[PDB]
Design a protein around this ligand. Structure first.
Ligand SMILES: CC(=O)N[C@H]1[C@H](O[C@@H]2[C@H](O[C@]3(C(=O)O)C[C@H](O)[C@@H](NC(C)=O)[C@H]([C@H](O)[C@H](O)CO)O3)[C@@H](O)[C@H](O[C@H]3[C@H](O)[C@@H](O)[C@H](O)O[C@@H]3CO)O[C@@H]2CO)O[C@H](CO)[C@@H](O)[C@@H]1O
Ligand SMILES: CC(=O)N[C@H]1[C@H](O[C@@H]2[C@H](O[C@]3(C(=O)O)C[C@H](O)[C@@H](NC(C)=O)[C@H]([C@H](O)[C@H](O)CO)O3)[C@@H](O)[C@H](O[C@H]3[C@H](O)[C@@H](O)[C@H](O)O[C@@H]3CO)O[C@@H]2CO)O[C@H](CO)[C@@H](O)[C@@H]1O
Ligand SMILES: *[C@@H]1O[C@H](CO)[C@@H](O[C@@H]2O[C@H](CO)[C@@H](O)[C@H](O)[C@H]2NC(C)=O)[C@H](O)[C@H]1NC(C)=O
Ligand SMILES: *[C@@H]1O[C@H](CO)[C@@H](O[C@@H]2O[C@H](CO)[C@@H](O)[C@H](O)[C@H]2NC(C)=O)[C@H](O)[C@H]1NC(C)=O
Ligand SMILES: *[C@@H]1O[C@H](CO)[C@@H](O[C@@H]2O[C@H](CO)[C@@H](O)[C@H](O)[C@H]2NC(C)=O)[C@H](O)[C@H]1NC(C)=O
Ligand SMILES: *[C@@H]1O[C@H](CO)[C@@H](O[C@@H]2O[C@H](CO)[C@@H](O)[C@H](O)[C@H]2NC(C)=O)[C@H](O)[C@H]1NC(C)=O
Ligand code: NAG
Ligand code: NAG
Ligand code: NAG
Ligand code: NAG
Lengths: 452, 452
């Protein structure tokens, strides 16, 4: 059995589904039933969390974390990894057929793992956690960074890596949880951590800040005061006042067995405080989702491009897509109602799937649409809701479950059946279950109907 | 990857764990967390039901039924089948690692499927349902019988079979849901159906009946009247007064590609009204669990032996293990409190795993112990509870979840780690979930502690 999706999906993956630059109305279909490819816990109080999912052209890759005790405890953890294909069922829609499983269970607490689809298998970037995250940021040396390659021929290889730029500049670095991407002989993962303010990187970027403004809901104050507050928001005392920074782990695939990879650090003039994220490749255009862990509560998606120069002088440029639609839940001064620059470590991972390009060869598409699963609360991780969103407003909403259902991380991927033109979106959501532990991670497949 | 369990379990499978014939105390451990090998539905109202599971010495086989609509809806169904191995984790206990998946999704409503572990794979016995079960029994011709072979080399073969004895004798025949067994070049599945009263088989067995009596809770009445009622209980008007009859589907494995198999029908002097069941092979001794679909509410386990004379006149002999411990839920006159012969189609599938032999070369072990999952109610499928039971009384109880949790079918298998002597029992239970459809089939693995 080849590691190849059904042919009707191969040319409908990682494509912009709506290329009209025109206005559209949307209807989200009912969940389509199949045997879930994501295993639940087998105990009422075991922790199962942190999904990472990538649908590649020929196969998909998936991973999440399993703890025998509650989520907050951190002695031991295990990492479930699987790869598989899309297969059409007689019910009229595809199912995710698992072809290989790896359960990393060796006493190493691999955490925040991000998965990527690579030729003949999967690649996974983790860090080994031995202490509290706050202890990581208070420290002076990053935790162990691991790169795991899992192939269809049942070969599994794992290496400790020390990417160029890490040592001397960072207190800590972890993967971005959201999936990475394989693109032009490069393996690219999202990452984030704490930069030592007095280091080389810290000094160069000391004055960098980005302050998005919702013109419909502006923050009160003079420009200079708001800018100073936005700059200070990058150094939360919760993380020992390090500069919390997003970054990209970039590895040369042709040297994947020996390279140490390299950290490509964006300018903080173009991005908010470091956080979880996801790297997408759609129509050969790279995008970066950034979790709204900082004060800005709206959905963060950037158009990004890399400049690769021979000797570790790689750079990345990012261009914020101006989105003002819905807010993510947060605590205290960092709820979905706050739009003012303050020191925030809050929010929740809720990534989007863009249905349309934003920047194209002809210009900029104001009729931008994206879809995903949100949490309908300004303060609480509750009420999972499927949505399609425009730049400024929501187009359609479809709750999952009853009001009051607790839920957390969500990651969404859409693809098209080029046989019958069906548009499918899978909404992978951490959902609170009455019988298994914190979060049955449920992959909800729906058909998306698009009209004028 | 070979289709072989971790070596520390191979000599601890299908063995009697307690062979001293002595009294013992038991403690059921907490559920051990792992990624469940049994997938849930992906919709809040999709049906996922009817588990069948076999752990063989080198690998396990599993299957269950998936319907896009609610369970009572009967238009379409699909059959999830998987095979895999036991792998020890760093958490100190094994997990079930799926190695192959088949999702039979072709518009044929395969139903009541029973699985068996066979060399290099699995064998599954289904019937194709096209109408109500009561319509099956009211009719005069049995539905299509299917045998599916699924091998580790990814070969899948399916055949329609017409076992010797079926045509002309049965209104209907379906598989017993509980797993079958591979034993002495024979593939043996449980089955049950409706025998035509006027047929050869119907006439030959017209006077056969079995009336078990609980010496601690007897039914009041004269022997002759109670015997007539027990005889009458085999012909429920719910199934059009056919003789409802258990049977065994026996296939020659070396001819499995061409043989039609044969029905081996036990005497109803030794068994109750036909029902779901399970065939076990422990210490090279065959056992038959029979669901208490009829008026008798206690756990039904028989010691069985076959006589093959290679002349299509094979026979089976059964010896009831007298168990009076706990009762299964039922409706109306067929609740767990009724012990009197009446026409019943009720109950629920709850199979046992015997920890001790009952009949042995030296004699009979009155210190017989078995374990499983019961439903703690005389009327309602609710309160799933793990138990260890003696012949007359329960030894230990451990509820799963909160009081009031709905649950249905349960199938239990125990095995031993011959490295550390740990005794593991997996209780596979249909549990009602708040987020997925009726019954997340959950495999709860526990360690069983046995003392004097
Ligand atoms: C570890 C933990 O407490 N688990 C909670 C979980 O807590 C939430 C935050 O954790 C996660 C998240 O957003 O779910 C999970 C992930 O493992 C974290 N990564 C790492 C490397 O540690 C990730 C990370 O912390 C962020 O991306 C920031 O870099 O976050 C948890 O960090 C957060 O803790 C709060 C704390 O409650 C609060 O008292 C303090 O003031 O600020 C902290 C930082 O915000 O709390 C989150 C929930 O509000 O949440 C789930 C429920 O969704 C619990 O059941 C888990 O046990
Ligand atoms: C099909 C259906 O109604 N599904 C119910 C489910 O119903 C229970 C009985 O069904 C099962 C069982 O025991 O769960 C399911 C299985 O698919 C059946 N097999 C076949 C081949 O049809 C099996 C079978 O019927 C028995 O083994 C007997 O041969 O039984 C269902 O048959 C039963 O129906 C009752 C009926 O409610 C009652 O009005 C009538 O007088 O007698 C019938 C026979 O007892 O009801 C069972 C539940 O009480 O039950 C679940 C809940 O556990 C529902 O959610 C499913 O939708
Ligand atoms: C398993 O698959 C992997 C990846 O497809 C194979 O990896 C490549 O194999 C060639 C051998 O000709 C190597 O020279 C390359 O360096 C490998 N690439 C990577 C990414 O490591 C591997 O050889 C296969 N192992 C087998 C067949 O046992
Ligand atoms: C790097 O990204 C930035 C966005 O942060 C790009 O700057 C924008 O360019 C467009 C079109 O040239 C202008 O309309 C915007 O006003 C610019 N924004 C800012 C803040 O300058 C920039 O062009 C990108 N650089 C490269 C080399 O591609
Ligand atoms: C896959 O495995 C099955 C079972 O091991 C093989 O089935 C055997 O094939 C030979 C055919 O040359 C027959 O003589 C045996 O009777 C078969 N056993 C059964 C139960 O069918 C099958 O050949 C294998 N298929 C492939 C493609 O290698
Ligand atoms: C077949 O099973 C029956 C039980 O239904 C056996 O009958 C029992 O036999 C033992 C020893 O011969 C007696 O102590 C019991 O009293 C018998 N019970 C009944 C109800 O008759 C029978 O022996 C078995 N036959 C064979 C050949 O093993
Ligand atoms: C970032 O913006 C500041 C002004 O806020 C400017 O002084 C600095 O040169 C910019 N750096 C980069 C790399 O854009
Ligand atoms: C949140 O739920 C409320 C129902 O109380 C509804 O009115 C509102 O539209 C929902 N908002 C979102 C963003 O889902
Ligand atoms: C079954 O028992 C009846 C008496 O109730 C007897 O006449 C008949 O011969 C017995 N048949 C068998 C096969 O045991
Ligand atoms: C059932 O639950 C009740 C608690 O209401 C308890 O008293 C009883 O022992 C339980 N029985 C079994 C068999 O679990």
């Amino acid at each position: 059995i080849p590691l190849v999706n059904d042919l009707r999906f191969i040319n409908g993956i990682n494509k912009f589904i709506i290329e009209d630059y025109a206005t559209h109305d949307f209807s989200i279909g009912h969940p389509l039933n199949m045997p879930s490819f994501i295993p639940t816990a087998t105990s009422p109080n075991g922790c199962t969390r942190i999904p990472s999912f990538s649908l590649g052209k020929t196969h998909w890759c998936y991973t999440h974390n399993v703890i025998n005790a509650n989520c907050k405890d951190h002695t031991s953890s295990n990492q479930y990894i699987s790869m598989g294909i899309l297969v059409q069922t007689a019910s009229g829609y595809p199912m995710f057929k698992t072809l290989k499983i790896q359960y990393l269970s060796d006493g190493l607490n691999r955490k925040s793992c991000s998965i990527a689809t690579v030729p003949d298998g999967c690649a996974m970037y983790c860090y080994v956690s031995t202490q509290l995250e706050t202890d990581d940021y208070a420290g002076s040396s990053p935790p162990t960074q691991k790169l795991t390659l899992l192939f269809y021929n049942d070969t599994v290889t794992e290496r400790t890596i020390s990417p160029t730029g890490l040592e001397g500049n960072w207190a800590t670095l972890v993967p971005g949880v959201g999936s990475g991407i394989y693109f032009e002989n490069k393996l690219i993962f999202p990452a984030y951590g704490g930069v030592l303010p007095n280091s080389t990187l810290g000094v160069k970027s000391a004055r960098e800040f980005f302050r998005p403004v919702n013109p419909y809901n502006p923050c009160s104050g003079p420009q200079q005061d708001l800018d100073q507050r936005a700059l200070r928001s990058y150094f939360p005392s919760y993380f020992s006042n390090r500069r919390v920074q997003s970054a990209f782990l970039v590895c040369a695939w042709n040297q994947i067995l020996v390279t140490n990879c390299e950290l490509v650090v964006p300018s903080n003039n173009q991005t908010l405080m470091g956080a979880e994220g996801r790297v997408l490749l759609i129509n050969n255009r790279l995008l970066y989702y950034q979790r709204s862990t900082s004060w800005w509560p709206y959905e963060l998606l950037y158009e990004i491009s890399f400049t690769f120069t021979n000797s570790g002088q790689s750079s990345v440029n990012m261009s914020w897509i101006p989105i003002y639609s819905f807010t993510r839940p947060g605590s205290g001064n960092c709820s979905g109602e706050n739009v003012c620059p303050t020191a925030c470590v809050s929010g929740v991972y809720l990534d989007p799937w863009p249905l349309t390009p934003y920047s194209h060869q002809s210009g900029i598409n104001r009729n931008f649409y994206f879809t995903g699963a949100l949490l309908n609360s300004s303060t609480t991780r509750v009420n999972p809701t499927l949505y399609v969103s425009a730049l400024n407003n929501l187009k359609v909403l479809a709750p999952y479950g009853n009001q009051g259902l607790f839920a957390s991380y969500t990651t969404t991927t859409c693809f098209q059946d080029t046989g019958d033109a069906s548009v499918y979106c899978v909404y992978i959501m951490e959902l609170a279950s009455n019988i298994v532990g914190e979060f049955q991670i449920l992959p909800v497949l729906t058909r998306l109907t698009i009209t004028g």
